[PDB]
């Protein structure tokens, strides 16, 4: 059905910033929730930040609350995760996701539908 195209990964060192992007392949008229999951080396996947398509309702993790910022482009049908002031612990594999089926805030970080192959972000010190 829907495939996700990720962009903007790479390598930085501590203190810099990165910008991740993700655009879905089809532009159906749904209320999907673009989110970001990260999987640290030798650990399991976990939620980072999500955003709703209709409004700019953003969820966040306790780890990254003041640093990270997520936004959406209504025109280009995109979503961007602006990572700021990276820590050496932010090294992981970052995945996007879709979650088309239900769009309520209380469940905005539990069950996504389409993932799309992850990007590699490896910050140094």
């Amino acid at each position: 059905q829907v495939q996700l195209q990720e962009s903007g990964g790479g390598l930085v060192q501590a203190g810099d910033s990165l910008r991740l992007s993700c655009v879905p392949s089809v532009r159906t008229s749904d209320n999907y929730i673009m989110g970001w999951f990260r999987q640290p080396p030798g650990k399991e996947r976990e939620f980072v930040a999500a955003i709703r398509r209709s409004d700019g309702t953003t969820k966040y993790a306790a780890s990254v609350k003041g640093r990270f910022a997520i936004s959406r482009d209504v025109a280009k049908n995109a979503a961007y995760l602006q990572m700021n002031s990276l820590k050496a612990e932010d090294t992981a594999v970052y995945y996007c996701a879709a979650k088309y089926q239900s769009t309520f805030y209380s469940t905005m970080d539990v069950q996504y539908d389409y993932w799309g192959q992850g990007t590699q972000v490896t910050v140094s010190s």
Binding site: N31, S54, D55, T103, F104, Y105
Partner: protein, 191 residues
Amino acid sequence: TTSAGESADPVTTTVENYGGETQVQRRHHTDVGFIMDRFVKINNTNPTHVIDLMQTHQHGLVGALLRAATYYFSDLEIVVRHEGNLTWVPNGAPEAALSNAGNPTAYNKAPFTRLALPYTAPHRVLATVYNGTSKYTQLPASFNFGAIRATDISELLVRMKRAELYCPRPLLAVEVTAQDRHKQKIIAPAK
């Protein structure tokens, strides 16, 4: 046909002017009551939303065809997808009235809620433009259909019932940059 242009009278020449034949036409699809009667999206919802029709997208079907009129009258239907109960207060109500169940409150069923609301504005007609103010770019605050409230609202749809439009205004199309015409992809079967 030749006529006085500066007088601004309407002139409708036919193909009969050179032997043709005007054919029978059916204009059921450009009827004002017909074309405005479809659900269209409102893409900025809040925990508390004031139903203002000028919040429809300006380039949608209903959004643009509504911007192409100065005044209008309509009832309304809304399709809300919410968590918890949904309270509706009419036009003119305090904002604190939205926390009580004496007002129309809908206890949420599974998919969503579909209601029909009347026209409660104190004016005979509503307007899309206003030249001036109403206190002692921005329309008067009484140009709305009420307000809704839930713990969080996911989507809102609206539908104009018994719609009436007055005093038409410009309605534009996408502009052609350098082509001879605006070319785009049209649906066609595979293979």
